[PDB]
Paper text:
Due to their key role in Zn2+ homeostasis, ZIP transporters are broadly represented in animals, plants, protozoans, prokaryotes, and archaea. ZupT proteins are members of the ZIP family. Bacterial ZIPs do not have a large intracellular domain, but contain a histidine-rich loop between TM3-4.
To overcome the non-outer membrane issue, we reconstituted purified BbZIP into the small amphipol PMAL-C8 to form BbZIP-PMAL-C8 nanoparticles. The final refined dimer reconstruction contains 37,954 particles at a resolution of 3.05 Å as estimated by the gold standard Fourier Shell Correlation (FSC) at 0.143. The dimer structure consists of 18 transmembrane helices, nine from each protomer. In each monomer, two Cd2+ ions are in the M1 and M2 binuclear sites in the middle of TM2, TM4, and TM5 as previously reported in the crystal structure. The cryo-EM density for the M1-site Cd2+ is much higher than the M2-site Cd2+, indicating a partial occupancy in the M2 site. His149 and His151 are on the loop L(3,4) which is disordered in the crystal structure but is well ordered in the cryo-EM structure through the formation of the M3 site. Two modeled PE molecules interact with both monomers and might contribute to the stabilization of the dimer.
Author numbering:
A (entry chain A), B (entry chain B): 6 to 309
């Protein structure tokens, strides 16, 4: 029934976007090979403390999202300027954290492994390509809807709008957990603490906005917060996947440092810059973006 | 006549946006003080070779823009997907160049001067605030128009649309020259070469697009290229202003490294992300953005 209609929608979408389908296939192959290597290494070696660090970071992110959701029981449908400012701040946090904490350490580590020069750029750019292809294929092959743009993805008029919004949230929050797990891969707390702090700080307002939007869809007051907390609960799964793919051979650490980063950057544009830069809302979004950029800069230079 | 109407428009705009007016006043005061200090130092000390480097970099940028403009005599009104891809590539180049080449060296230099920790973040964040306030006040107090969004700024129905488009180009291209001049302030070719190469590479497609748009406004075929070359000629003035403000006392070097950077980041959003992320054009813009990000990464890790 539903499977048949979804399969037909997938086939019709594949007939229209071949390049994206090939990109998704290649990226999925790369990711599954990386995860197999990580599982093999986890079976042979002993890197359990890194798993502990990753799960604790995911738990912190989940707590931040849950707190942001619980903040929505008193605000009662905040205005649009505040929403634009908060989402711009979150986008700036994500962008700056990605750039600094997932390009500079990756370049240094890759230069250590292979030799300084263009080779480190090559490996981390391969990571960026993998991440972008994965996220693009996912957001074109997943039936979601955004709050303002509309219904994005394959057509399926057999599921309620709540599930489409939840899928949008899932797409946003997978790369964050992935990035946390990637960061704690090599120990070296000097990366994981800044990255995790930035992720939690930007997931507070995002969780609040998600709770408000899910209320707007129709869930009365008590089920929006539950779904926001559920997405927060999703984040540790991304943390586990990231720590799985970052282990294995040594060169798999720089590559992941790019992959997640690329995904994060991608999601921002393709999911966050629309709905924040739409129809004369650029000023507040830009101001929030710069404020988040500065705050992440402080965190980077201070926390480690 | 025209001065009276423009003055009335400015007063009406000031009655509506007080915070932006105060921000522009503070930023202008800071910039003029920095420039006075730079002029005094130039009169007392001997930093002429840095002026030579800055003017040569501005000349290279002007040549790149002129070549991009001359490329428009054969393309003859390229499609919209190509325009979105090129502008996304340019935005990615600007963003990545800003972030890396104007935050990391600035943080290192500030930490050298004042001490590692949050103090370097404080000084470069002051720079970011100054730059953002300057650019915001300018784009709200300047009668320009963007290609698609419409007529942005104070009302003045007494000048042709060509001048409004030229003013938009001027607003885009001032921070680029400023950044070049800031980069070559302390010698140390390891920054200026990557920053200048990125600026020239992203100003080729921008010059081509400007030539096409000015043709679309109505200039037949032979005057659009002239105006694009004129904006390229503008860029060295920004280079001179940047080298002027970056000289002076030592702590004026990190601050500028933030200022220009902030301005650059600002302009991207508030001027480039709209017109590239509008009405189902996100995919090509994002792909171009990631390609430009990777190319700037290569340039950073290789050229110096
Ligand atoms: C200089 C280059 C400036 C312009 C480059 C970007 C323009 C490419 C945009 C093409 C595009 O949008 O096509 C989409 C998919 O493209 C794609 O899927 C291309 C994916 C390429 C991703 C590359 C991003 C990271 C690159 C980093 C380098 C990594 C390697 C380094 C060693 C949609 O196409 P459609 O399928 O919908 O239908 C197409 C039927 N005409
Ligand atoms: C945590 C904070 C998250 C949210 C922060 C951003 C929200 C602020 C947006 C306010 C806003 O858009 O107002 C505009 C001008 O604001 C402004 O002009 C504010 C300018 C602030 C710029 C700060 C950007 C860089 C900050 C980096 C820190 C630098 C210092 C570090 C030591 C328009 O206002 P209007 O004039 O049109 O009318 C207003 C009459 N209600
Ligand atoms: Cd989407
Ligand atoms: Cd999240
Ligand atoms: Cd986020
Ligand atoms: Cd503007
Ligand atoms: Cd330019
Ligand atoms: Cd540019």
């Amino acid at each position: 029934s539903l499977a048949a209609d979804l399969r037909g929608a997938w086939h019709a979408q594949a007939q229209s976007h071949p390049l994206i389908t090939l990109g998704l296939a290649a990226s999925a192959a790369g990711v599954v090979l990386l995860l197999v290597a990580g599982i093999v290494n986890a079976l042979t070696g002993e890197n359990r403390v890194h798993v502990g660090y990753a799960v604790l970071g995911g738990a912190a992110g989940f707590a931040a999202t849950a707190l942001g959701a619980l903040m929505a029981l008193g605000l009662r449908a905040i205005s649009a300027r505040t929403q634009d400012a908060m989402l711009g701040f979150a986008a700036g946090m994500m962008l700056a954290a990605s750039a600094f904490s997932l390009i500079l350490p990756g370049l240094d580590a890759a230069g250590t492994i292979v030799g300084p020069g263009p080779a480190a750029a090559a490996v981390v750019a391969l990571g960026l390509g993998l991440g972008v292809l994965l996220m693009l294929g996912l957001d074109y092959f997943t039936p979601h809807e955004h709050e303002r743009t509309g219904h994005q993805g394959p057509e399926a008029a057999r599921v309620n709008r709540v599930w489409l919004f939840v899928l949008t949230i899932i797409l946003h929050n997978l790369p964050e957990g992935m990035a946390i797990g990637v960061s704690f891969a090599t120990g070296d707390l000097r990366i994981g603490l800044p990255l995790t702090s930035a992720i939690a700080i930007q997931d507070v307002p995002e969780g609040l906005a998600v709770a408000l939007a899910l209320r707007a869809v129709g869930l009365p007051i008590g089920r929006a917060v539950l779904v926001a907390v559920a997405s927060g609960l999703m984040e540790p799964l991304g943390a586990l996947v990231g720590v799985g793919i970052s282990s294995g051979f040594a060169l798999a650490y720089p590559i992941s440092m790019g992959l997640a980063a690329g995904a994060m950057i991608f999601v921002v544009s393709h999911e966050v810059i629309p709905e924040t830069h739409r129809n004369g809302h650029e000023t507040t979004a830009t101001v929030g973006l710069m404020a988040g950029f500065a705050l992440m800069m402080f965190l980077d230079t201070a926390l480690g």
